[PDB]
Ligand binder design. Structure first.
Ligand SMILES: C=CC(C)(C)OC[C@H]1O[C@H](O[C@@H]2C3=C([C@H](C)CNC(C)=O)C[C@H](O)[C@]3(C)/C=C3/[C@@H](COC)CC[C@H]3[C@@H](C)[C@H]2O)[C@H](O)[C@@H](O)[C@@H]1O
Ligand SMILES: C=CC(C)(C)OC[C@H]1O[C@H](O[C@@H]2C3=C([C@H](C)CNC(C)=O)C[C@H](O)[C@]3(C)/C=C3/[C@@H](COC)CC[C@H]3[C@@H](C)[C@H]2O)[C@H](O)[C@@H](O)[C@@H]1O
Ligand SMILES: [Mg+2]
Ligand SMILES: [Mg+2]
Ligand SMILES: [Mg+2]
Ligand SMILES: [Mg+2]
Ligand SMILES: [Mg+2]
Ligand SMILES: [Mg+2]
Lengths: 236, 5, 236, 5
């Protein structure tokens, strides 16, 4: 790969520069190169990996949503035949999005998840695995959709099981996993009651644990708790 | 859309 | 080129979709493909071309500025030796930026400017030529810098001469040309007095012409007039 | 930075 000749430490340094410059594609490429050096990622490095790909796919998802909305309007009664272009361009963005998801999932499967034994790292990577399968599920229409949904649920569930055993309720990774799995239930899996139940129990159990939360993690965990409350307000 | 992190 | 098999009308349609999706790289590639069909661009199509590349290079410039600032701090007294990475990554972004500028300038030179006879189109493309040479000037340090600056000034000057002869003072293209050439004088060419004089005369002459301005162009021209006033407030 | 269009 194009990053094979660069030192691991230089790749991490440049991922940090790319983040500051909001160059998320470059950030992701640097972090993929770092992962491919074959050493486990530290806690800070895991965050660089996740932020890079979250931002790349986030932009692709936003664009896909705009184009899918145009396409759906184009297929309603009274809409004028505008030819294949909207579908073609939506398919182009979709295929690029799928490619990025596949790249992330490949990194996770080789070999980040296999070698992650500490709960932080294992839950973190399984959450990512659930997230990228969820993004594939958002665009899946074919025979593939149910299997993709099942793959997302299986990753999120393994992460949930570990997080409940090994992390406190206010751990930010545990909270963010529960936030995203609740969104999976609501938006992907047609299980709004499960989504609401998960968000409420997560929020309530985190409140009761706030008295043990570190000042260093207060900001991250309270932000995620606010996002859980925002979703519950949207949903009820 | 709902919030994720 | 990759767009050679696509119909011109389909390229224009997809450039409009890309704009709505804020996919400016795709937008630019679609518009480059359209230009390479060999027909002149309409007024609407010129705007799609300009917006696409302005946004691509705008993001590159923002990233270059972040990295150049880090690099300059890294070279001040008391800064710690962090190795070649900041320079390398700034050079990477710079080379990509230069490549996009070169692509735009090549499109303009082949054959948009040669075939543009109406004042709107000719001034529009010469303004773009000045803009992309100015962006090359922002990053130029080598022997090349003075020639690049001269190329920007020559394009802006030809555009200015045509715009004063052939367009009313409140024409948005005429106004935007003067705005950008004034910024060239201030930020690139070390001529703040010329920048101020140009911005003030442009603004004053446009005010006196507002009574002929169309309702369709009022928003564009008054926006640009406000930008001229903003720059004059920054500069005086 | 100053404004351009
Ligand atoms: C070093 C520079 C950068 C900009 C890369 O660091 C980003 C942030 O990395 C930490 O945060 C983490 C985190 C978020 C916080 C909620 C952001 N916090 C605030 C107040 O906005 C959102 C991110 O996507 C990230 C990495 C992802 C997860 C997800 C990751 O699932 C795979 C789970 C929850 C959250 C955890 C890991 C947070 O610990 C720090 O603690 C923060 O200071 C820091 O900004
Ligand atoms: C069709 C959809 C899109 C989004 C592509 O159309 C964008 C806008 O194209 C027109 O505007 C033009 C223009 C700007 C206006 C100032 C935006 N106006 C407001 C109120 O924000 C900024 C752009 O960069 C652009 C193309 C560039 C130039 C530069 C172009 O130098 C090469 C000179 C001045 C200005 C002229 C051409 C404006 O005529 C319309 O008239 C506007 O409605 C419309 O938004
Ligand atoms: Mg080494
Ligand atoms: Mg598809
Ligand atoms: Mg339960
Ligand atoms: Mg044809
Ligand atoms: Mg260089
Ligand atoms: Mg003069």
């Amino acid at each position: 790969g194009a990053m094979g000749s660069m030192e691991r430490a230089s790749l991490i340094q440049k991922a940090k520069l790319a983040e500051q410059a909001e160059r998320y594609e470059d950030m992701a490429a640097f972090m993929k190169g770092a992962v491919e050096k074959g050493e486990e990622l530290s806690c800070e490095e895991r965050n660089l990996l996740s932020v890079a790909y979250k931002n790349v796919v986030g932009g692709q998802r936003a664009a896909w949503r705009v184009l899918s909305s145009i396409e759906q309007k184009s297929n309603e009664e009274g809409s004028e035949e505008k030819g294949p272009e909207v579908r073609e361009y939506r398919e182009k963005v979709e295929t690029e999005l799928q490619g990025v998801c596949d790249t992330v999932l490949g990194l996770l499967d080789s070999h980040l998840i296999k070698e992650a034994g500490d709960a932080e790292s294992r839950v973190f990577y399984l959450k990512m695995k659930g997230d990228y399968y969820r993004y594939l599920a958002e665009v899946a229409t074919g025979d593939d959709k149910k299997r993709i949904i099942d793959s997302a649920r299986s990753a999120y569930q393994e992460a949930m099981d570990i997080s409940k055993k090994e992390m406190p309720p206010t751990n930010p990774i545990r909270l963010g996993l529960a936030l995203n799995f609740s969104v999976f239930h609501y938006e992907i899996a047609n299980s709004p009651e499960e989504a609401i139940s998960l968000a409420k129990t997560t929020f309530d159990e985190a409140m009761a644990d706030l008295h043990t939360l570190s000042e260093d993690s207060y900001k991250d965990s309270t932000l995620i708790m606010q996002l859980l409350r925002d979703n519950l307000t949207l949903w009820t | 859309f709902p919030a994720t992190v």
